[PDB]
């Protein structure tokens, strides 16, 4: 019962409570840009601010050896409290080596296994509770069970974008059914089943023309929409479907694309100014796939420029991805698909193209390759572990590693292939 | 016309300072003072830098010493930040030149060096440079709003507004401040309105009276006494907001009490954020930035509930005790002045709350010195009261003082301040004939 091993971690969340209160040095907060990132990013900002803690928030793509020294540079002169959200449990043996002071809140398969790791670094890892950090909680959901040691309880909003954002919706278990639950009890979210076009809030036409969840690539487009709605008649101009509209896009839809899943969803509406969880988690991954970290933080804090940014960027990224998938060149081997594309679309395009097998999606940034790889929680369930998979790029000089359904890795460039079959065959035998 | 031109010659510099800006990628270290105006100052700076993509650490100092820029200067080393001083840095210019700093000070306060391009690595935006006097037309936050309207950002008016208060340039607004205001106006970020001060509070009125400090009205000033004199003029004393039947009321009979009741009224400035009243707002980032809360008052700033809500609660506790230390007070009359020993942290802050007809002078005594603090108020300057003059005359003790007609301090040794009181009582009963 998750109840009982919520007791346990609380144990945890004290702690970690008591090292930030009794801190009065710099606080260093690293994050991830990808929308669970962003969100533990501003739970954190929004926590640290209301305990009077003035603080530096870095964003890192990555938390490779390179940053984790340079950010050890830092602690010559005034030695940092940092803060760690989706990341450093891989990375522990680099962070006790350079000693940092250091709270790590992530929720990748931990190295060590122990919360309490010297006398200067505490992990907060739900793995090591047995709860799996795949399906049942997020880096966000990990800050907020920090936050509501405080009795942040509106910071529930933006762990509720993290799970979106990082896929744990559907179906929603663990601690991220106690934290919606929780939320919905202090009225910070409402629940609704309704279809996906009506959280974009835009004429529906381009609400399913730049949708990918789910995509359909025969009405991906204005155009196609637009006569789409015309011919069962919807007023494609409008911005929201009623009961009647809705019955007929959803019977329209199942009829010629019978294998299509998850129109109806069940939408989050938060006390936010972006009102849809779904819409915030689409607009924080968006700008955090163009650099615009710092922006991404600030719609977390509900500035208005910042989500007038956001806006703007949102529909710029979702015509881009429209674009890319329409001109991606997927390979096949055994046992998995992979394709080369544009940096910041990589992990999102692998996760739409899954279907009965891993997608892996690379793009060259330099002398490296840089891979995303996507499966299923069916191929899970038959044994699929990309962590393992992807940490073969040691052999080949690189690195890798995350989840069990998604991880990544880096290559030398002119190694693309050979890891590639490395991984095609590891896969093979894993299922 | 004129307003236009001058606002020509500091966008040079301000247009300067973004480039700067938008093309570091490297790490921002803002560093702003702990009052209204610097609190406020980091409100529209952290604005500004999320808005322009920019992460940054903010850091609040009470003064920046020379120690300070060395502690600083130890990071420069290990990363070459951009730093952006807020409400500080002309006066320490040398030091930061000395350490090679790439910096943007923003700062209203008289600059050492009077350039606004230092060389390669130092701008510096400073109304002084412009003949804007920093004392009267623009505060730290207004500068930073002028950079902030550089990315067209007016929404940051209001935390510009509440600087003005804060620094009390309010009344009268002139020069820049009146031209930021009505920037907000035009855009709406603000509206303007007479009013009675106690209406800024949104409590009930018998508490906003009781714990009033602009003015401080010694026989309203509890819970009891504002109760009964509201009961006594027909005024419901739960009520929040007074109407115009209420004031009227209550000017008619608190006159007896408080004759300048002109100090009363107010332009209230009601502005876009979730704290509705600027004043309000100014009062509320003092009581934290007094408290050490800083984090808290930047959090205040943006808007985030529970920030506002500690800010609430702080600001209470903070004019009740207040309240408390006035009534404490053990008010000593010369001739010409009172005089009161009390503590070292609120000397300054009581003196100025006790002006009502003459000149009031706190001290304490701290080892072996006594250290003065002088307050009047504009209707006694207008008279002839100088009080840089009078408490400068410290030096014939053995000590030294001075500051601003209105306002100035002095020290001398503890064992001659009846000596030091009977003088400046004394050149004060002359410059008032
Ligand atoms: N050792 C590991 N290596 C990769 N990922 C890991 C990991 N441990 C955990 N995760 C992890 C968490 C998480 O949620 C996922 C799904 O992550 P991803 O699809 O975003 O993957 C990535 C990672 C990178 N990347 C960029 N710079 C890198 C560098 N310098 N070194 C190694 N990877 C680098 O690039 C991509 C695609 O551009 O992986």
Redesign the interface.
């Known amino acids: 019962h998750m109840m009982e091993k919520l007791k346990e971690i609380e144990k945890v969340t004290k702690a970690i409570k008591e090292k930030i209160l009794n801190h009065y040095g ?1 606080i260093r907060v690293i994050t991830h840009h990808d929308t669970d990132g962003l969100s533990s990013g501003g739970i954190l900002a ?1 926590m ?12 890192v793509e990555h938390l490779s050896k390179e940053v984790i020294e340079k950010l050890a ?2 602690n ?3 030695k940092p409290l940092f803060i760690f959200a989706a990341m450093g449990s891989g990375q522990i043996e680099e962070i006790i080596k350079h000693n940092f002071n250091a709270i790590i809140l992530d929720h990748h398969p931990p190295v060590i296994k122990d919360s309490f790791i010297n006398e200067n670094i505490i992990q907060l890892n739900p793995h090591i509770f047995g709860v799996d950090g795949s399906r049942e909680i997020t880096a966000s959901g990990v800050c907020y069970l920090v936050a509501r040691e405080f009795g ?1 309880y ?1 910071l529930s909003v933006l762990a509720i974008v993290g799970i979106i954002g990082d896929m744990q919706y559907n179906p929603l278990l663990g601690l991220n059914k106690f934290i919606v639950n929780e939320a919905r009890e202090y009225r910070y979210v409402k629940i609704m089943n309704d279809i996906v076009y009506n959280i974009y809030d835009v004429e529906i036409y381009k609400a399913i023309a730049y949708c990918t969840k789910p995509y359909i690539p025969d009405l991906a487009s204005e155009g196609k929409a637009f006569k789409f709605l015309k011919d069962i008649g919807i007023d494609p101009n409008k911005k929201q479907l009623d009961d009647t509209d809705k019955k007929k896009l959803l019977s329209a839809i199942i009829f010629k694309y019978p294998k299509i899943e998850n129109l109806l969803i069940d939408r989050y509406l938060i006390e936010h100014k972006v009102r849809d969880a779904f819409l915030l988690s689409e607009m924080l991954n968006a700008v955090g796939r163009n ?5 991404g ?2 719609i977390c ?6 989500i007038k ?1 956001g806006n703007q960027i949102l529909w710029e990224y979702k015509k881009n991805l429209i674009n890319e998938l329409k001109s991606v060149k997927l390979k096949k081997l055994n046992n998995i698909y992979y394709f080369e594309g544009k940096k910041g679309m990589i992990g999102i395009i692998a996760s739409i193209l899954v279907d009965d097998k891993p997608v892996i999606g690379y793009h060259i940034e330099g002398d490296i390759a840089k891979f995303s790889a996507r499966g299923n929680r069916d191929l899970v369930n038959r044994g699929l572990n990309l962590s393992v998979a992807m940490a073969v790029a040691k052999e080949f000089g690189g690195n890798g590693g995350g989840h069990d359904v998604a991880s990544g890795a880096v290559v030398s460039k002119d190694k693309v292939q050979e890891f590639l079959k490395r991984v095609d065959e590891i896969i093979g035998e894993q299922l």
């Open positions: 710099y929004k640290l601010m209301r305990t009077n803690k003035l603080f530096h928030l870095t964003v540079k830092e010559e002169v005034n942040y509106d650099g615009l970290f710092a922006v933080i600030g804090l509900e500035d208005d420029e910042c940014i």
